[PDB]
Amino acid sequence: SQDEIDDLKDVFELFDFWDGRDGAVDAFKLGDVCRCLGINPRNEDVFAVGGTHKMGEKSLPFEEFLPAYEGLMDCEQGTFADYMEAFKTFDREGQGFISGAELRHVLTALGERLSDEDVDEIIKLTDLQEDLEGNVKYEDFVKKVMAGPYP
Amino acid sequence: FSDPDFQYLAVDQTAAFDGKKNCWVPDEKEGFASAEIQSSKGDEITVKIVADSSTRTVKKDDIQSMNPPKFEKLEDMANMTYLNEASVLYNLRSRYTSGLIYTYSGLFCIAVNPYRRLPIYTDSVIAKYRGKRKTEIPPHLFSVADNAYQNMVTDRENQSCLITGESGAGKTENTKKVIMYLAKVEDQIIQANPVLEAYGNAKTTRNNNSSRFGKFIRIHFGPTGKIAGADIETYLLEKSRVTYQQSAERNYHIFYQICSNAIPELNDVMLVTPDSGLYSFINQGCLTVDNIDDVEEFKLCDEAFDILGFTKEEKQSMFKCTASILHMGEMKFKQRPREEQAESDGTAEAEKVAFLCGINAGDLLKALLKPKVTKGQNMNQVVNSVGALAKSLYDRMFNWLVRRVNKTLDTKAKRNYYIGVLDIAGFEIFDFNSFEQLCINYTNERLQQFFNHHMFILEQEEYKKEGIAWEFIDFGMDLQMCIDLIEKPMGILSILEEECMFPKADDKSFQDKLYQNHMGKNRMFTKPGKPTRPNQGPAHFELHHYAGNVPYSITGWLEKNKDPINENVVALLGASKEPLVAEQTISAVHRESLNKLMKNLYSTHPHFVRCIIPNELKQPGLVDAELVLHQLQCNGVLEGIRICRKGFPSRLIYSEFKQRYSILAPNAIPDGKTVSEKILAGLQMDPAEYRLGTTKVFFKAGVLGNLEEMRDERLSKIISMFQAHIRGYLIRKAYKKLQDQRIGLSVIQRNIRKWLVLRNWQWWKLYSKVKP
Amino acid sequence: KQIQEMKEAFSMIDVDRDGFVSKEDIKAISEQLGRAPDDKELTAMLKEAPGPLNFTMFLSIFSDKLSGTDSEETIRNAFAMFDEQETKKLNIEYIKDLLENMGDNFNKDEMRMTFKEAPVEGGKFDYVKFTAMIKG
């Protein structure tokens, strides 16, 4: 819709400006752009539409940008069910727990990995805390991440 | 995967292959030969042997369909187009000559003896097999063990591995690796083998380390799925090897360890001269053993008694009682022309015996030459009661020994379920076979038939139970008979058992009473045939055992089954000084132990291991196709695979199915039996590849492996999607911080360009100049 | 006080003390100090003022120059906006990087002209002292 495309516009600027204002954005940021308009595509997802692994590789106008966002819209988003399901498969106890160490492993080691920094990051952000045994309720965590930075 | 850990574990294939020319033709040396048809002629086909390039004819109905190079060294044979004695033997032998000794035959595993050490059991390798699903990683015994674990855990039930095969195949080696495996994913357990093997193993022509007792070891697990205890059961130890040993064979391992000087300090404790060829009871057959260092084995055996937690006295009580035996057989005798009763021929050796057993040497030789109402014994009645004593002691030592090692393992911790392992002694045919063998063989039969039941008889039953659909298939695999010939009401053993209770009986009334009952009334029982091996000692009858025809000599079977030690000496020892020493027929008894074992087994989800002896030469990497092929026959491999391809070997309780495969169509799940009706429905799953069931789902072969495929895939995505969610959260979180700097930079950029252009203004220049 | 100077200035510039600034007035004083502008410079330099240069059209063009700019506080903040730790200094490589290829990219000259004055000592470029210098 218009108020929508206007939103793409709004954000496109903040970005195209920071990597040198000139009406073009580094295809390596196309991810973060859309990540700002709510959506959270997967790296596999982004490259599919035009994203790049590195800066410099290439820049893009707003003309080519419209469809990348048309694209990253029709792509699957994870529900609470799904995040709850997957996390259960690591719980031997079955009581909604996990250890810090393991959670760390899941994030950094499995699936489209996550740098060790983004991890200590979101941990601190969501202010996730372990008990005496060093375990955490993965149910709470999933809920925050899902919540947003500003709830 | 480039992992060094897969050198002798992962399979390392095109052209010249006409699916209508190439086939398998019978052979005498290789069992089957690679042939290429040349000309038909009714039934007389004329093929060319690819090897030597010779030519010959072969009945048309004797050609076997060869498999395409597509299935070279295949890891799972149930996936082959053709599962015939020649396709199977070819696949195995293909793998084997390349280091790969493990292959799945459908639902059970095949192990072909390597006769050499392989770097496939390391801790490096164990790490990789942990929690892996059979299709996920190369074939290995760890996988079989690892899987039984997962089942016991998730399915909440007892597991069990029946590791079968011929003698010298790999039954024991593999049983140990399973425990060693389960233990690694403890120290005393592993350490119980060295002592039990020292006391219950011996060189034999077939095996340099032949197990002479049956072993069933259960390994208990706790509420966190970790080892919380363990017990051992043993069956029919060869009481006879103690005093006798056929040529080229040794007595139990200990006796030779004890006379090596691994621990000189002990020589005087046992009163032994470090020479084995000095003691009659252990120098009859062999003395040394290519590849068995009695010195080091003694040390390790000693070392193992410590770890087992054996007080120094305890473990010296053992060593002495067994060294004592080494003397019971040194006690010489004489008669005394007259009555003969018998008199001694010295006393030196007969004292060392009374000494070590803490009893009076006097009171001994006394109750041994004129057992008490008295009744003297002649010169042989004695030398034979000497043996009766040696044998009977050793049978008590071994029994006490096990009770004790269980003392050290029955940790009173909390038990959930367990995983037993069955290693029973296998089939063996020698130059001369007697009661000992019939017992081992009857034992091994037995087991095979179990596999037959649970494999064919069973499979179809469950199909009925659940109330699916199906038509029976007769794999014609039953030995109830052979079994029956030996165990049933009037059987062989039952005849012998009722023959012992008569003091009148003898080797002829027993032999006649046998034909009297089964000659011609049971075809498994056949008059002794003709020699199929030199030095073939006497034979009184033959039995057609699953893995062979055995000519049995029944001489001495009456005493062998009714034991007999001077109830007198049992009194002496009853009150001996040594604390250890102080502490129904055989047939009936064993028949009962065995029946009880079988009963314990049936209550299980069995995983089968099939051992295979590559040749009769004990040399590594060499194959004898005939022998191999021959095993691939009496073991039921092929058939064992047909049903895996033919029928539907899977089975899942909707309760455990919903929990594991809901994540494959969650946008269709609002009762465990309907939820699955939905999931499998959603997936638009072919009605073919599966079936209904009242309490459980039946998935054709492979399908479940493929569901665990789709299962992962989704689990990986979802994990990515939550990582995407984390990527998008962190980005959006730092968005304010990115608007502010975009402004704060435009200030500076536009406001420096101003102060820059203002200095390039003549007026300002000149102004600034005047300033002072 | 910006005015007080302007006047006293206009005084020293208006040599022929006639209350007006003429091509000769400018040329005059310039030379008494540093090199002076060429006729063309002096010409268009005056044409910048519609009519005679009384102390009025003077303050007029000067004020219309310095117009269209912000605060010393407003700028000192647009700066501390990259001074996370609040140290009152920016690391030279950083600032240079920002201005150089970010937002409305500067140019080498804009870059040199800018840092020829900049107060950088110890790796850190003090944006306070420099905000003053560029302002009041």
Ligand SMILES: Nc1ncnc2c1ncn2[C@@H]1O[C@H](COP(=O)(O)OP(=O)(O)O)[C@@H](O)[C@H]1O
């Ligand atoms: N996986 C194997 N790796 C190496 N040697 C083995 C293996 N399996 C069996 N062997 C060899 O074969 C011999 C007989 O094996 P064993 O397990 O004792 O037979 P049985 O079936 O009679 O218990 C072993 O002592 C060893 O030399």
Ligand code: VO4
């Ligand atoms: O030789 V084995 O008796 O261990 O079958």
Ligand SMILES: [Ca+2]
């Ligand atoms: Ca740009």
Ligand SMILES: [Mg+2]
């Ligand atoms: Mg064995």
Ligand SMILES: [Mg+2]
């Ligand atoms: Mg003037």
